Each structure stands twice: as C-alpha cells, then as structure tokens.
Amino acid sequence: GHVLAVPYPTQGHITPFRQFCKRLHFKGLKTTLALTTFVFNSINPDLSGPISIATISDGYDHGGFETADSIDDYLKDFKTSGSKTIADIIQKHQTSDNPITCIVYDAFLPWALDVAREFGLVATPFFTQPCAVNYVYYLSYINNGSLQLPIEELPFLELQDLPSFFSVSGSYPAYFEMVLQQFINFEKADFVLVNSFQELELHENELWSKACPVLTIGPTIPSIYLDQRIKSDTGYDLNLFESKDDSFCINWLDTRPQGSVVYVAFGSMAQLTNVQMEELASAVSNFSFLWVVRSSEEEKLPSGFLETVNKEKSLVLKWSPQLQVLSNKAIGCFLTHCGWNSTMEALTFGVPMVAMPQWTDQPMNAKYIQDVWKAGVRVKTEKESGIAKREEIEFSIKEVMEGERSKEMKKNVKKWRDLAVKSLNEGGSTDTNIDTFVSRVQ
Ligand SMILES: O=c1ccn([C@@H]2O[C@H](COP(=O)(O)OP(=O)(O)O)[C@@H](O)[C@H]2O)c(=O)[nH]1
Ligand SMILES: *[C@@H]1O[C@H](CO)[C@@H](O)[C@H](O)[C@H]1O
Ligand SMILES: O=C(O)c1ccccc1O
C-alpha cells in the first residue's frame, strides 16, 4: 500500500497532511507527500520523521499565489497544472517497488478524485476543518448555495456564528465557491477524512455521517504531546516561516510565573489593518504578553511600538513554536484568530482562549469555543466596523485570566487532552478509523 497525499499549499493544510502521514507510516503505510514546487523551495527541510516528497505545480512556481491575477485564476490554473503534475507522479511510480494505490487529496481540490479514478486509485478527500463547519457547507450545497436559518438540526446557531461568506455578503466569491464545491463529487469518494476526533463534536459528526461516510482521524497534533505511540513525532516539521531558532522563546517563558503570559497569534495567513493593530497593541500592553506579528505585518504596528515593548514583561516575534508555547505553563490565555489547527491545539493543551475571529470558518470555531466547549470568550466587535476596540479586547482577556468564569473555563477545557489521547491510543475512535482506512488501502 502507498498513499499520495496532496495538501492545499498553505501551512494550515500542510501540517495536518504531514502529521496524518506520520500516523500512516507508524501503521505500516507508505506515503508520498505532494508539495507544489513553490512551497518545496520555501520549506527548510529539518525533519522529525522519514519523509518522501514529490513535487507538483499549481502554475506559480516562482511567485506563488501573490503573483496570480485573481483568486479564481489561481484555482483554475491549479486544477490544470495540478492534474498534470499529479498524474505524472502516479505514472512514474507504476513501475517501481511500490506503485501508488490511493490519493488522499485536500477537500479544497475535488478534481484530484478525477485523477485518482483515471488510474484506478482509491480516493479520499481530507477536510482540515471541523465537522460542524463542513456540515453547514454541505447543507448549502444540497441546497443551491445558501442556508436555512435556523438550521433545524443545530438551532443554537445565528448569523454571526456562520462562516464569513454568509455574514459578509459578496466577500471572497471564488473562495466561497471552493468550500461549497468540496461536495460536488465527494459521493464517489471511498472515504471522507476529517482532522477531528469523535468526542469533540459528537453530535455534528453524527449529522454529517448520515450523508456520507466520515472518518475522524484527528487531532493531528504530534504524538509526543498526546499518545506518545510514535516516538519520532516530536513536532511540526514542514514550516513555511523560518523557525527563529525558537529556544530563545521557550527559555523566556520559563522565566515567567505560571499562567502569567497572554499568547497572541493569528495563524499564517490573516492580515489585520493599521487600525486593528493599534487597538490590539494598546489592549495587549496592559499585560505580560507574547505576541506573534509576522514579518509582512510589522508595517502596520504603531510608529515606534516595538521600541516601547517592556522587555521585562513581554516579547514580540515573527513566528513561534506554537506547539511548545501552548504546552508551557506560563501561558494564561491564548488570544486567537480561531484557525482550526490553533483551536484544537489550545483545547488539547487546556489553554483557555480569547476568540477574535477574522474570516472563513473562524466565526464557527469561536462560537464553539465560547458556548459549546465553554473554553473561552469571543471578543465583542463594534457592528459598524467589525473591529474589536482596545477595551473590548482587554475586557475579554481579563475575563479569561481574572474573572471566575475564568476558573470554570479553566477546568472545562482540561477535559479534552485526555479525550484526545484516548482516541489516539489503541482502541480509540481515531485509532480505529485510521485502521479502517489502512485496511482499504492494502
Ligand atoms: O506563530 C505561529 C502562529 C501559528 N503557528 C502554527 O501555525 C498553524 C496555524 O494554522 P491555523 O489552522 O491555526 O490557521 P491558518 O494559519 O490556517 O489561518 C497552527 O498549527 C499553529 O500551531 C506556529 O507554529 N507559529
Ligand atoms: C481576507 O480578509 C481577512 C479579514 O477580513 C484577512 O485576514 C485575509 O488576509 C484576507 O484574505
Ligand atoms: O487555508 C485555509 O485555512 C482556508 C480555509 C478556508 C478557505 C480558504 C482558505 O485558504
């Protein structure tokens, strides 16, 4: 058995795809990971497991996404160039020790099924977003692109709870058509994989599994932090942002008392405005903080803000070893844009969050953080503008550090570590679902 693994070319999709492959290798399955050449020349390959990489093309080997004329051009070029480049990996390996038997492609790339079917291969999409989010999208697809509020099977959800495509009308029309066209052919899939575990959205997994065979194979957080069954899986080893020489960071955090630091980070792709950046900077400077401002975003922090940094309470970085930060006892709360990987990381580490979602599926994750998992609070935004003002930010941070919702939320969230380990340990639902997939593949 041999699996070709095709992530969407961003950090948030690549690392679950890699981590999943480490589990496949642990279970005796050969995997080749298909990176775009733009990405492959942007990686800095320090590994934490055996890795086999094949290169494919999205049609932007030189400049990547930012050189495309439009988002919708990128997707269609990606389909054309990606279909050819993926086919060639399959062809080339046919006469080899292990010809490929299964394509595990990102759900954002449904055309990979066509390629998988043309070579008689097993095909399974891989959803990097939670069951709740995708079931919402699925219900729109079997509709014709909009949704019945309230959702009869999940009626506690409102307009501000939905993905940004619904509440910001007309925004990202091409990206909106992508998340819906995840379902154009998923019927024909041999299985459907989602980077979640059953006990985290037990309800919403059921709803979605009525329509399609869903196999939860998360969480994709490295084995060392949970189940420890995979000795080599110590961290995230395919990173698009250079690694700071990260022990400066983790040494600084063992300097500070337990639960004293506020961690701030917005993922790999989210861009705030100048206005957004000073409201944050003021609210956060009321605290001992660790803030990740990526390099493309230093522009928009206040004039001379990085000088005014109190070096005895707080620190600003271009990027961070987020896994090790969230495992560090000096963190008190995590101010997060609610990217799915970041949310599952904070839940697994028992770090309560201040949710400050920005777009696509982050509003849903923020609702579940506050009202389903009761593991954090959503910051309030002025409705004219969608911007969180410095005092609404500071209010929310204090509610998770000092309020006494704060020690209730503190204990509600520590439930999840042990649930996640149980699913990754022998006989867990995730460990069982991975075995069903491995069974099919050979
Ligand atoms: O400074 C940082 C910020 C983020 N991350 C990692 O980058 C991923 C971010 O993906 P996520 O799903 O949170 O959001 P997206 O980045 O896709 O918008 C997560 O695994 C984080 O652990 C990191 O390692 N250092
Ligand atoms: C879409 O817009 C969000 C905020 O609205 C920004 O974070 C992204 O960079 C952009 O693609
Ligand atoms: O990379 C992501 O996380 C993503 C998620 C939803 C829609 C578009 C995207 O690029």
Residue numbers in the entry: 6 to 447
Lines from the paper:
UGT74F1 and UGT74F2 are the enzymes responsible for the in vivo glucosylation of SA in A. thaliana. UGT74F2 exhibits the GT-B fold with ligands bound in the cleft between the two domains –the N-terminal domain is comprised of residues 1–245, while 246–449 make up the C-terminal domain.
Analysis of the crystallographic thermal parameters (B factors) of SA and surrounding protein residues support the SA conformation shown in Fig. 3c. Based on the observed SA and modeled UDP-glucose, we propose a SN2 reaction for SGE formation by UGT74F2. Given the pH dependence of SGE formation and the critical role of His 18 in UGT74F2 activity, His 18 is probably protonated and forms hydrogen bond interactions both with Asp 111 and one of the oxygens of the SA carboxylate group.
